[PDB]
Amino acid sequence: TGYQEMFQRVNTRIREFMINELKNHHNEDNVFMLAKNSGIEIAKIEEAPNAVLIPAFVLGELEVAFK
Amino acid sequence: TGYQEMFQRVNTRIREFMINELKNHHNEDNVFMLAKNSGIEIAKIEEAPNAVLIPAFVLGELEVAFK
Amino acid sequence: TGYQEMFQRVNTRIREFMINELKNHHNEDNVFMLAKNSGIEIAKIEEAPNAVLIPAFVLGELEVAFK
Amino acid sequence: TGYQEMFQRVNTRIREFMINELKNHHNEDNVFMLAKNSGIEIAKIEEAPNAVLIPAFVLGELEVAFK
């Protein structure tokens, strides 16, 4: 239970900094591109689940790293 | 969509070494415990979705790290 | 050894977002504190080695995560 | 100070499961290859500093993942 709460806040923190990185580097299209090829319907990238958000973020970091 | 299948193969690899780490240090109970608390019904840890598998793996590693 | 330039790019990217996270959440003191205890003399957090920077970053994320 | 201890144990745990992954998938040559290309001299992969151990581990996982 307490574990479920602690991990919830850890998860929330990770989601926020991933969302922050995607915005600051204008890579939000990665989220939509990946969402479009999975069936998820989102208005904001905040509505993206981890299965979409995390790959988007990693691609984003790679694109910035190798520019 | 090639990115999807690439991340599909990365997801599989990560699940495999998490599961491997959990067995080798006999921490499978972490998975079941977390599965039960979240209303998930599994007979073996390979059936656990990442939302319980990943926290269980993390608990496992800290348990070993601070034993 | 092209792998090494490539990993150097990824190292730089990771340093940059760790540093950005630390500044944007006003957690730079973590770096200086960890530096002082390790006999490392730095004037700014961009000079902290990863052995200092990474633990400060993680400490920083947990502090923000748990309020 | 308690941090220097806790992060030491985390570090040790992480080095151990990386070394275990490299051995179980017979990817030790990744470590020697990268170490030789950095002017470092090791007999065991256990003597590899994180700066060669970590990217060697990552290459190893990718090779297994995409094999």
Describe the protein in words.
- The structure is a homotetramer of 67-residue chains.
- Chain A has 67 residues and is mostly helical.
- Chain A has one domain.
- Chain A is 72% helix and 0% strand.
- At the B-D interface, helix 1 and helix 3 of B face helix 1 and helix 3 of D.
Please indicate the count of domains of chain A: 1
Describe the sheet with the most strands of chain A.
none
**Strand content of the residues of chain A, in percent?**
under 5%
Number of strands of chain A: 0
Largest interface (CB < 8 Å): B-D, 14 and 13 residues
Briefly note the structural class of the backbone of chain A: mainly alpha
Function (chains A, B, C, D): Plays a role in the flagellum-specific transport system.
Protein name (chains A, B, C, D): Flagellar biosynthetic protein FliP
Organism (chains A, B, C, D): Thermotoga maritima (strain ATCC 43589 / DSM 3109 / JCM 10099 / NBRC 100826 / MSB8)
GO cellular component, one term (chains A, B, C, D): plasma membrane
